């Protein structure tokens, strides 16, 4: 079901074409090509734009169009730890399934998609804060090590959303972790038409719209 | 002039009172 | 049992008419047509003006008027705690009842009214107040992450009140996000007459006021 209107998106066809071109392509190709080339599968994406401008709209639709297990979504900075250390336990409990699957099966495991709402809530300048407790540094470093480090990962996809790309530490943006970046500006006239239609199909279905409109 | 403060907790599960009751009972 | 006069608010008839039209229109018509439309109720309202113009009393009376449960009010920044993480835990407990009730019955639950006083005390511009502990930026992120997001809620209504509407977040006042933004202004002569009559009703009824006035 790749209708793209049954799903309900505001004429963002070109956006999806470009994202599939850039990524999700090595994902549907012969592994043998990936051995001759030796190019790894991209595992980082970012979607930012006018606050809630259909920013979570497609985030709530991608979970359907995929023939793998339902992607796990993290809704905002709920990684709270009251005693000591369990913030790093929470961060750990996100990637356990990927580790287990990769150990169980390799080169054909599948994909696991993780979504961080309010990325900006938890990822800021490491040294800027002067607070006595350094929890933010602790979580930032743990996440950095998990996404990138001596240990290798090949069956994950991290997606990040912020309504203000500015308060983000540059270390997390180094090439090889979140190299890809994309913006969602505003809807064209033509896309506005499809939008109106999508937002008015039921209206016309039950004969509640005056022909003058 | 500036600065604010903060605080935190930790895993302690002392319950020294109950352990003291128990061990005293053991002694008797 | 009800009456507009019973409340004892005068001079804001247009304001009440607009509020009722844009807030309570979908909650009074027979369910069949509204359900045939697939429209989501509005769940946001914001008020502001100079002190002593009857903003507090307005919310007091609007809450009292409903045949719903007693509204939960928050008196300024009363949801802050001395530890890491319980600003969010406090801003999150406010929605347990609505979520539970929606999941038990669904589509037939009563409204849940929440009132914030001086919203500007807690909700302000992210990227500002560059002090320490970043708690404010975390609270704002949670509040938005919870008013809207991956989960759906249709039995809530939030009222905010401020005096300096230029310091609130943009998305917090966007569509479906305190979208209705009203403007209470100093009364007119007719408003003055109505007000004086309202505050001089218990006197004429006991012959305690001389007819000379
Ligand atoms: N182009 C669009 N097409 C369809 N719906 C859109 C579009 N732009 C915005 N919307 C509407 O905006 C909402 C999409 O969710 P939204 O992006 O606001 O969530 P959010 O990112 O959690 O919000 P916020 O960032 O403000 O916390 C839906 O009500 C959706 O219908
Ligand atoms: N429309 C109105 N009807 C009756 N009283 C009003 C009205 N507007 C203002 N008042 C009077 O003004 C006062 C309300 O001020 P209030 O709205 O509480 O200020 P704030 O909004 O800063 O808290 C009350 O004493 C009330 O008698």
In DSSP notation, C135-163 reads: HHHHHHHHHHHHHSSSS---SEEEEEEES
Residue holding tokens 């305190």? C178
DSSP β-bridge partners for residue A46: A160
Element (H, E) at A48: strand A44-48
CA distance A40 to A24: 12
Residues 6+ apart with CB under 8 A from C68: C110, C111, C112, C113
Rounded CA separation A208/C105 (Å): 29
Determination approach = cryo-EM
**A53-60 contacts, C-beta under 8 A, 24 or more apart:** A53/A184, A53/A186, A54/A9, A54/A10, A54/A12, A54/A184, A55/A161, A55/A163, A55/A184, A56/A117, A56/A161, A56/C148, A56/C149, A56/C150, A57/A8, A57/A9, A57/A10, A58/A9, A58/A12, A59/A115, A59/A159, A59/A161, A59/C150, A60/C150
Q: Is C94 left (phi over 0), alpha (psi -120 to 50) or beta?
A: alpha
Chain center to CA of C162? 11
Asked whether C195 and C11 are in contact (CB, 8 A), the reply is yes
Residue A17, class by beta-carbon neighbours within 10 Å (0-12 exposed, 13-18 middle, 19+ buried)?
exposed
What does the alpha-carbon distance between residue A163 and residue A50 come to, in Å, rounded to a whole number?
6
Contact check, Cβ <8 Å, C150/A203: no
Residue reference for tokens 């302000």: C124
Residue A53 sits at φ, ψ, to 5 deg, of -85, 65
Are C182 and C165 in contact, with CB atoms under 8 Å apart? no
State the Cα–Cα distance between residues C113 and C115, nearest whole angstrom.
7
Q: Please choose, from the candidates C65, C58, C60, C55, the residue with its C-alpha nearest in 3D space to the C-alpha of residue C3.
A: C65
d(CA A46, CA A116): 10
Nearest bound ligand to CA A4? 1
Rounded alpha-carbon distances, angstroms, from residue B2 to A124, C96, C106, C130, C213: 21, 37, 49, 11, 58
φ, ψ for residue A91, nearest 5 deg: -55, -40
Residues of B in contact with A131 (CB under 8 A): 6
**Is residue C111 within 8 Å of residue C66, measured between CB atoms?**
yes
Q: How many other β-carbons are positioned within 10 Å of the β-carbon of residue C99?
A: 15
Q: Under DSSP, is residue C193 helix (H, G, I), strand (E, B) or coil? A: helix
Å between B2 CA and nearest CA of chain A? 12
Cβ–Cβ under 8 Å, residues C95 and C146: yes
Query: Residues near C170 by Cβ (< 8 Å), separated by ≥ 6?
Result: A51
Which residues in chain B have Cβ-Cβ distances shorter than 8 Å to C83? 6-9
- Coil, strand or helix at A135: helix
DSSP 3-state percent helix, strand, coil across chain C (nearest 5): 40, 10, 50
- Residue A180 parent element (H or E): none
**A206 contact C CB<8A:** yes
| Sheet strands (E) in chain C | 44-48, 72-74, 112-117, 156-162, 180-181
- Inter-chain contact A84–B6, Cβ cutoff 8 Å? no
Which strand ranges, in their side-by-side order, compose the sheet holding A156-160? A72-74, A112-116, A156-160, A44-48, A182-183
Q: What is chain C's Cα-based Rg?
A: 20
**Would you call B6 and A83 a contact, using CB atoms and an 8 Å cutoff?**
no
Q: Best interface-test mutation with C: which of B2, B5, B6 has the largest number of C CBs within 10 A? A: B6
- With vertex at residue A160, the alpha carbon angle to CA A155 and CA A164, rounded to the nearest 5 degrees, is 165
Contact with chain B for residue A132, Cβ under 8 A: yes
Q: How many residues does chain C have?
A: 213
Per the CB < 8 A criterion, the answer to whether C98 and C151 are in contact is: no
Nearest CA in chain B to C132: B4
Short-list A141, A99, A101, CA closest to A122: A141
**Does residue C67 belong to the interface with chain B, where contact is any CB pair within 8 Å?**
no
* Spatial separation of the C-alpha atoms in residues A88 and A140, rounded to whole Å: 10
Supply angle C-alpha A100, A103, A105, rounded to 5.
105
Q: Are A183 and A138 in contact (CB under 8 A)?
A: no
């Amino acid at each position: 079901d790749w209708n793209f209107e049954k799903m309900g998106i505001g004429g963002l066809d070109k956006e999806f074409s470009d994202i599939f071109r850039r990524a999700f392509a090595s994902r549907v190709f012969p592994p043998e090509i990936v051995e001759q080339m030796g190019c790894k599968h991209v595992k980082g994406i970012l979607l930012y734009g006018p606050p809630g401008c259909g920013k979570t709209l497609l985030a709530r639709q991608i979970g359907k169009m995929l023939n793998a297990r339902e992607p796990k979504v993290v809704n905002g900075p709920e990684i709270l730890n009251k005693y000591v250390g369990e913030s790093e336990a929470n961060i750990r409990k996100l990637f356990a399934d990927a580790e287990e699957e990769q150990r169980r099966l390799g080169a054909n495991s599948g994909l696991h998609i993780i979504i961080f709402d309010e990325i900006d809530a938890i990822c800021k300048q490491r040294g800027s804060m002067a607070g006595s407790t350094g929890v933010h540094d602790t979580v930032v470093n743990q996440l950095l090590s998990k996404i990138d480090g001596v240990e290798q990962l090949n069956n994950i996809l991290v997606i990040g959303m912020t309504n203000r790309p500015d308060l983000i530490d540059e270390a997390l943006l180094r090439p090889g972790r979140l190299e890809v970046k994309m913006e969602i500006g505003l809807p064209d006239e033509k896309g506005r038409l499809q939008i109106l239609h999508i937002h008015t199909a039921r209206m016309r279905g039950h004969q509640l719209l005056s022909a003058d409109v | 002039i500036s600065k604010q403060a903060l605080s935190e907790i930790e895993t302690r599960h002392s319950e020294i009172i109950k352990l003291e009751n128990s061990i005293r009972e053991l002694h008797d």
